[PDB]
Structure formats: C-alpha cells, structure tokens
C-alpha cells in the first residue's frame with residue numbers, strides 16, 4: 001500500500017514524490033490526473049502520466065473526447081489507469097493562467113469523493129497557476145475519501161507541510 005506519507009488529517013496524506021513513480025510503485029486503484037477539458041496531456045502531471053503510459057493515455061483520451069466532447073472545468077471522467085493504476089480519474093481544476101474561476105477548485109476536488117482511495121496531485125497547482133497552499137486547504141476541506149497527495153517539488157512539499165494549519 002502507500003508508504004512514507006505524512007498524515008495531515010483523518011483522510012488526507014502527503015508525500016514528496018513523483019506521482020508517476022508513486023503510481024508505478026503502488027499501482028493504486030485510482031490515480032488522479034491534473035487534466036484539462038480537452039484531455040490534451042501535454043505537460044505538468046498530465047504530460048508526465050501520459051508519457052509513462054507510452055501515449056496510451058492520450059490515445060484513449062482522444063477517443064473519449066471524440067465521443068463525448070470536452071469536460072467541464074471542475075469536472076472529471078474515469079478512464080483506464082494503463083500501467084499506472086486500475087483507473088485514472090482525469091480531473092479538471094481551474095487554470096488561473098487561462099483566467100478560470102478559482103472557486104471551481106472545490107468542485108474539482110468533489111470528484112475525489114466518488115472514490116474511496118486515490119493517489120493524487122494538488123489540483124490547479126504547478127502549471128495551472130493556483131497557489132498550492134490554497135489547493136491543499138481546499139483539498140482537506142472538500143475531500144472526505146482517503147487521498148494520498150504526491151508533491152513533486154521538495155521545497156514546495158516542505159512549505160506545504162510547515163504552513164499546514
């Protein structure tokens with residue numbers, strides 16, 4: 001199971017880890033992707049997860065978009081986890097670098113509540129432009145299921161833990 005995590009709350013855990021390496025190691029039932037509405041996994045966590053699947057995640061995602069159209073900001077879809085997990089929950093947090101409503105971050109985290117346990121990144125953090133400290137606060141105040149957060153950046157992980165209220 002998950003190892004080396006710091007317990008933040010009853011159900012939220014955090015670790016300084018590369019979510020791809022963490023997924024390959026644990027093979028969780030659900031790995032969360034920091035997706036965009038088009039499921040175009042170009043960079044950040046999405047680009048890294050997709051590259052780990054040898055682009056199979058992108059091929060599957062393009063078929064999903066061709067059939068269903070884009071996701072909503074704050075929405076999600078469950079697709080295959082490929083070699084990383086049983087499932088990948090593609091969750092679209094608001095991208096503040098695209099002027100998207102940061103209030104949609106709570107709606108984005110609500111998708112995690114449909115899964116009993118998840119391996120996840122901080123939504124809207126990194127290249128999505130939101131403050132990761134704010135993302136962690138929304139996560140702990142929204143998610144009620146067991147979430148294991150992987151924070152790639154050591155310095156950010158330390159800042160998140162040391163400032164956690």
Ligand SMILES: CCn1cc(NC(=O)c2ccc(F)cc2)cn1
Pocket residue numbers: 125126127129130131132153155156
């Ligand atoms: C650790 C590497 N890294 C940190 C960030 N983000 C921030 O720290 C931040 C802080 C305040 C903001 F208003 C927006 C973003 C993205 N990558």
